[PDB]
Each structure stands twice: as structure tokens, then as C-alpha cells.
């Protein structure tokens, strides 16, 4: 236990008066509402209460920024489904217990209500009541988080202007360590309610709210399906020798439920389309079938913001599809035939699925006349696959999903891989098509409609049998998972684990490799 640290960094005086909590809102609420007196005894960790200061952070980087509320406690964020209203202050600790070789200071201010958010430069964060503290402090730095308000309480709906608590990185982090390591101090943030926190009015406990952090399905990735091709997942892996910021359109959801692009909710819709065909027997390339692209069930198609019908193949290649048709010959009614369409651009085509028309063909010399009508196309095999966003118009622009990124310097995209049926002539290896998130998470996020807190979700990946955490990763709020990997060779992981969330982290959270 070295005392070359700073143990004289106690809870300093802040220029603020004591603020009355539940004594004001007692005769304006309709009932008597006390909470359990063992909630006030121990400091438990905030849900957004995990941050990290790498030495690649400039001064003026906001480490955490969390409003006062019931979202600073796992107990009060659980009790606030039962109530509509809260008052009173909290008491927040800070575990900044970095190494004895680091050097640097943080400053934790007390931003009042109705202060405009956004910029908050480092010059003006000292003008608030603030506490300055080193990153080597042994004891936990305590600080009060008062409830400055003009109304008698706050509703438990997060649009309340309330007192924030911003932590700017004041001076940069550096180590006087004799070689090759630059330590990343990993702080935590503990909190408990003060002596006069109180909820206001009892209410039916609704789960679908705020806070009620994100949950994930307990299913292994070797069981889940793929969101760019109708197949299972066959092992996730990182690779820094690939297109690093792709621009896919299938299987890209937000973590507030809103699907982004041409992505469906059902898993039997990806790389599939349904249309009302128009067949014709040609003396050239066999048959020609135009299409009028609509949904699979029967919903109409008007070209709006999605670049294609939901579930359209968002890659490039020569796609062989299966459709059962009504042959007008005498002896057989139904037989599924195999067309082949120019799904890729291939430097020239005649198809533009943004306005609802693709054109398939099957090489057949006999006069094969088909009763035209509604059909549903499904893929069979791929020929000359490229992972490029195709031409949804003929050569024009379309409303696309934005490209995947940006990452931090040193963060690699996590890719769930599957293998498509291919038509290969000289090659004997499988074609690898990867997605940013499987379909079982898109149907989990669309069917729950979560509320994102800050910027990103800190995940883990734990093996089922050993119980060993394989890695930790950072699920951003755009539906991709970026983890920190240093090298460049393709690193592969086992697939029998299960993901599990931990906390909300900002974009500045440096991950361990």
C-alpha cells in the first residue's frame, strides 16, 4: 500500500447551498410514498457508470455526462416503473484508482438546468461548481448532485431539464513508466440516493419504458440465422484485411427499433422478393420474365425512402432464383423452374429495382409458355459474387443506408459469417458473406423498441461451459459491433457463447484487446 499517491483528495467544498428535496413536494402529491431504507445504505454502480481514459484523449473530451434522475441507480431505475415522479438529490462516488505512474487531472462540474447542451468547451467547465481531482486518488471521491428545479417534482419521462454532471478531461493522461506500456485508467461511478429522495405517485408497472436497459436473447450465434442470406451463422471472426467501412443495406437496425435500409423483420424475407411476373418465350435467351416488385404478402409498393423492397438482395452477382409457375401444357400444372437474373451491376444491366422492376431469364429452347401472375422468388445459388451495393436505379442515385462507421483508431468490425451456395468453376473454397448483426437481433430490436441512452453498448461474450469471458466489444447505436484488435491476421472465435450487455458507454471508451 504505497502512499506516493494522493490520499488528500477528499470530498472538497463546492459553492452550493443545501437544496430541499421531498419537503416541498409533500403537500402536492396525493399519497405517502417511502422507499426501502436499505437502498440508502450502499453505493451501487450506475448503469451508465463505466468510463475509461486512454492516453489518446485530448483535453476537453467529455468522459461521462449523466443527468440527475432515477437512471443513476439500478434500484431506482427499477422502482421508477411503478411511479410517476421523483424529487431529491443523489450522492455520487468516483473510483479513479489508477496506477502510481500515471499523471493527469479530471474536473467534475455541476451544470444547472436549462443550460444549452452541445459544445461545453473546457474553458467554461470551470465556471460551474466543480471538483478537481487527480487520477491516482486512493479513496473514492464523493460529491453531491443537487436537485435544482423550478417545479415541485419531475416526471419520470426523460425530457426533464435537470441538473447534469459533466466530467471533462482537464489535463491529458501520461505515464512516467520506464518502458513500453501506457496504462488506461478505468474508472467507475457509484451512487446512492441521498436522505430525502422520494417518489411521488404510484402507477401500474409498465416494462416498455426508458430505463429498462437493453436485454439480449440467450441464444448461441451457432443457432441464429443470417441477415444477408437465408442460412445459419458459421462462426464470427474479425479481419482487418477486408472492406473496413462497408455500405450494406440488409440486416442494419438501430437500437431504438427503427430499421435502416431494405431490411425486413422476418427471417424468411432476406434475399427474396415477390412480384407479378410477365413471361414470354424467346427465340434468343430462352425466356424473359419482367417483374412488378411488391411485398411478399400483398402490401403495395410506393418508392419512398427504402432503396428497394424489404428483403431485396443488397449484394452483387448473378443470382439464380426459384419460382413455381403454372405451365399451360397438358399433363403437368406446377413445376418450379430456375431463372437467372443480373442482380449485380456487372457494368451494364436493364434492371432498376428502385422503381419496382427486375428482369429474370431461363435458357430454354422449347416454347415454354407460362400463365403469368403472382410469384415469390427465392435464391438458389450465386455466380460471380461481389459485396457491392448494386444499382437500384439504372445509373442514378438512391436513398441508401449510411456506411458502417466510424470506429476509433485501432477498432475492427465484428463480422458474423455464413457461406452461400455458389457456382464455382476453378475454386473449391466457400464464398464468405458477412453481416454486421444477425437477424435474431434485428427481430429482437424491432419487437422491443428500446431507448438508447448515450452512444454505445458495452457487450461481453462468455462461453457456456467454461464460463470464460472471451472478449468485450462495443455495440454502437447504429447496429454494428466494433472491438479492439491490434494485428492484421484473421482472428476467429468460438461460436457456442452468448452475448450479454453490461453498460452504456460513450464513443471514447477504449477497449482491451
Ligand X SMILES: C[C@H](CCC(=O)NCC(=O)O)[C@H]1CC[C@H]2[C@@H]3[C@H](O)C[C@@H]4C[C@H](O)CC[C@]4(C)[C@H]3CC[C@]12C
> Is residue 298 a contact residue for ligand X (CB under 6 A)?
yes
- If binding is defined by CB under 6 A, does position 374 make contact with ligand X? yes
Q: DSSP state, 357?
A: B
Taking the C-alpha atoms of residue 10 and residue 139, their distance in angstroms, rounded to an integer, is 8
- Residues 242-301 touching its own copies, rule: CB under 8 A, are 264-269, 296-298
Q: What 3-state DSSP class applies to 79?
A: helix
Whole-number Cα distances in Å, 400 to 145, 244, 272, 390: 44, 18, 19, 11
Nearer to its own copies, 181 or 256 (CB): 181
Q: Which is nearer to its own copies, 184 or 481 (CB)?
A: 184
List the grid coordinates of 476: 454502437
In order, the DSSP letters of 453-511 are -SSEEEEEEE-TTT--EEEEEEEETTS-EEEE--S-S-EE--SS-EEEEEEEE-TT-PP
- Site membership for ligand X, residue 324 (CB under 6 A): yes
Q: Is 80 in the site for its own copies (CB under 8 A)?
A: no
Mark the binding-site residues for Ca(2+), compressed into ranges. 422, 424, 431
Cell (9 digits) for 57 = 484523449
Q: What DSSP line would sit under 112-147, residue for residue?
A: PTT---S---TTSSSSSSEEEEETT-SSPPPEEE--
For ligand X, the binding residue among 419, 424, 446, 491 (CB under 6 A) is 419
User: Which three cell numbers, joined as nine digits, stand for 340?
Assistant: 437467372
With contact defined as beta carbons under 8 Å apart, do 210 and 438 qualify? no
Query: Does 297 contact ligand X by CB under 6 A?
Result: yes
Q: Which of residues 120-159 bind its own copies (CB under 8 A)?
A: 121-124, 126-127, 129-130, 132, 134, 136-139
Q: Binders of its own copies among 348-407, rule CB under 8 A?
A: 352, 354-357, 376, 378, 380-381, 393, 395-400
Minimum gap (Å) between residue 382 Cβ and ligand X: 8
Give the contact letters, 179-208, x = binds to its own copies (CB under 8 A), - = no: x-x-xxxx-x-x------------------
Closest separation in Å from C-beta 232 to ligand X? 7
| Site residues (CB under 6 A) for ligand X, limited to 259-278 | 274, 276
471 is a contact residue toward its own copies (CB under 8 A): yes
Distances (CA, A) of 366 to 282, 284, 340, 342: 9, 11, 17, 23
Closer residue to its own copies in complex, CB, 159/425 = 425
Binding site for ligand X (CB under 6 A): 230-231, 234, 274, 276, 294, 296-298, 323-324, 374-376, 378, 419-421, 430
Amino acid at each position: 500500500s504505497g502512499q506516493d499517491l494522493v490520499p488528500a483528495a477528499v470530498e472538497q467544498a463546492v459553492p452550493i447551498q443545501p437544496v430541499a428535496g421531498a419537503a416541498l413536494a409533500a403537500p402536492a402529491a396525493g399519497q405517502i410514498n417511502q422507499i426501502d431504507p436499505w437502498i440508502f445504505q450502499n453505493f451501487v454502480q450506475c448503469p451508465l457508470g463505466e468510463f475509461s481514459i486512454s492516453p489518446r484523449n485530448t483535453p476537453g473530451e467529455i468522459l461521462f455526462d449523466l443527468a440527475l434522475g432515477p437512471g443513476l441507480n439500478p434500484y431506482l431505475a427499477h422502482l421508477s416503473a411503478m411511479y410517476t415522479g421523483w424529487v431529491g438529490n443523489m450522492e455520487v462516488q468516483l473510483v479513479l484508482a489508477g496506477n502510481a505512474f500515471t499523471a493527469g487531472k479530471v474536473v467534475v462540474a455541476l451544470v444547472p438546468p436549462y443550460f444549452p447542451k452541445g459544445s461545453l468547451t473546457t474553458a467554461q467547465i470551470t465556471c460551474f461548481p466543480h471538483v478537481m481531482c487527480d487520477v491516482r486518488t486512493l479513496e473514492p471521491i464523493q460529491l453531491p448532485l443537487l436537485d435544482v428545479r423550478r417545479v415541485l417534482w419531475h416526471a419520470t419521462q426523460d425530457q426533464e431539464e435537470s441538473m447534469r454532471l459533466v466530467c471533462m478531461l482537464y489535463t491529458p493522461l501520461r505515464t512516467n513508466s520506464p518502458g513500453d506500456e501506457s496504462f488506461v485508467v478505468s474508472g467507475r461511478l457509484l451512487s446512492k440516493p441521498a436522505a430525502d429522495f422520494n417518489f411521488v405517485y404510484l402507477t401500474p408497472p409498465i416494462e416498455r419504458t426508458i430505463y429498462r436497459m437493453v436485454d439480449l436473447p440467450v441464444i448461441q450465434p451457432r443457432l441464429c440465422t443470417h441477415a444477408r442470406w437465408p442460412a445459419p451463422v458459421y462462426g464470427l471472426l474479425v479481419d482487418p484485411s477486408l472492406p473496413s467501412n462497408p455500405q450494406w443495406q440488409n440486416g442494419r437496425v438501430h437500437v431504438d427499433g427503427t430499421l435502416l435500409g431494405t431490411t425486413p423483420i422476418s427471417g424468411s424475407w432476406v434475399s427474396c422478393f415477390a412480384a407479378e411476373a410477365a413471361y414470354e418465350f424467346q427465340s434468343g435467351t430462352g425466356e424473359v420474365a419482367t417483374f412488378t416488385l411488391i411485398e411478399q404478402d400483398g402490401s403495395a409498393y410506393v418508392p419512398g425512402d427504402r432503396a428497394a423492397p424489404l428483403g431485396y438482395p443488397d449484394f452483387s452477382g448473378q443470382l439464380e432464383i426459384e419460382v413455381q409457375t403454372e405451365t399451360t401444357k397438358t399433363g403437368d400444372k406446377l413445376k418450379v423452374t430456375t431463372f437467372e437474373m443480373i442482380l449485380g451491376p456487372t457494368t451494364n444491366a436493364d434492371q432498376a429495382p428502385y422503381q419496382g422492376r427486375v428482369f429474370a431469364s431461363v435458357t430454354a429452347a422449347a416454347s415454354l409458355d407460362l400463365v403469368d401472375g403472382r410469384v415469390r422468388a427465392v435464391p438458389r445459388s450465386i455466380y460471380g459474387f461481389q459485396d457491392t451495393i448494386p444499382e437500384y436505379n439504372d445509373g442514378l442515385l438512391v436513398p441508401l443506408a449510411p456506411p458502417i462507421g466510424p470506429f476509433l483508431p485501432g477498432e475492427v468490425l465484428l463480422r458474423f459469417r455464413t457461406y452461400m451456395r455458389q457456382i464455382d468453376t476453378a475454386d473449391a473454397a466457400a464464398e464468405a458473406i458477412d453481416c454486421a448483426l444477425p437477424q435474431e437481433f434485428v427481430s429482437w430490436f424491432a419487437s422491443n423498441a428500446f431507448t438508447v441512452q448515450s452512444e454505445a453498448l458495452l457487450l461481453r461474450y462468455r462461453n457456456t461451459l467454461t464460463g470464460q469471458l472471451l472478449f468485450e466489444c462495443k455495440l454502437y447505436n447504429e447496429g454494428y459491433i466494433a472491438l479492439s484488435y491490434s494485428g492484421s491476421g484473421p482472428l476467429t472465435f468460438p461460436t457456442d457463447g452468448i452475448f450479454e450487455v453490461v453498460s452504456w458507454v460513450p464513443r471514447l471508451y477504449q477497449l482491451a484487446s
